[PDB]
């Protein structure tokens, strides 16, 4: 699209500047242009792709939640009717959020996933696919909500199978994938016991592997603390 005329290395360099500037919309557009160059992404470029859209969709999800809450209060007994404006604006933000999710899923399908052969790239993109279907599931209500949930579950499950076969239990991608799949179970699939079992098992198995550098120790234990935090919240 608009990034077709810019060099791939320049799109990557400008994505790093945009992150420094906290310009995450720019960053995602730069990284979308870099992806559309057709070459596979390095580990550092995959992380930039992830950071950019996580921040874009993270703001949209936060706004959607503020508007959905206002809307639900507007639909209670005794609340005065204020017209269609709250539903209209909630729908406006919701449509934008879905558009970003579709953009990400579109990049994964054309053609990041089918070219990823290594475990680290393939699990990373399948986790992303699960995450962004999960963001769609947060706002889904119609006849596709079941199918959206199952697309999230399917992508997470495929990533889990690969990561258990191919990665050590302390690998940050494996840990982050298990954390988010556990959040899927708890928050989306109404399976809080499956969420808790997954989180406890993932934590204990990483704990028994920590003894195998101080730098990687710090990376894994950071994510294990998130599993711990959730377990404390959930039990």
């Amino acid at each position: 699209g608009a990034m077709g005329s810019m060099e791939r290395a320049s799109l990557i360099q400008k994505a790093k500047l945009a992150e420094q500037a906290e310009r995450y919309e720019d960053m995602a557009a730069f990284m979308k242009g870099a992806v559309e160059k057709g070459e596979e992404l390095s580990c550092e470029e995959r992380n930039l792709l992830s950071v950019a859209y996580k921040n874009v969709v993270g703001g949209q999800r936060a706004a959607w939640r503020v508007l959905s809450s206002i809307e639900q209060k507007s639909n209670e007994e005794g609340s005065e009717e204020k017209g269609p404006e709250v539903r209209e604006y909630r729908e406006k933000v919701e449509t934008e959020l879905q558009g970003v999710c579709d953009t990400v899923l579109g990049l994964l399908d054309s053609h990041l996933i089918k070219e990823a052969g290594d475990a680290e790239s393939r699990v990373f993109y399948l986790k992303m696919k699960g995450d962004y279907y999960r963001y769609l599931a947060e706002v889904a209500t119609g006849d596709d909500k079941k199918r959206i949930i199952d697309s999230a579950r399917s992508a997470y499950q495929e990533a889990m199978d690969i990561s258990k076969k191919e990665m050590p239990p302390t690998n940050p991608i494996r840990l982050g994938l298990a954390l988010n799949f556990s959040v899927f179970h708890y928050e989306i699939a109404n399976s809080p016991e499956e969420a808790i079992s997954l989180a406890k098992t993932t934590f204990d198995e990483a704990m028994a592997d920590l003894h195998t550098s101080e730098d990687s120790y710090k990376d894994s234990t950071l994510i294990m603390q998130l599993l711990r935090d959730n377990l404390t919240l959930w039990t």
């Binding site: 840990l175 556990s182 708890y186 935090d229 959730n230 959930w234």
Partner: peptide, 5 residues
């Protein structure tokens, strides 16, 4: 309210 990463 759950944390993701």
């Amino acid at each position: 309210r759950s944390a993701s990463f």
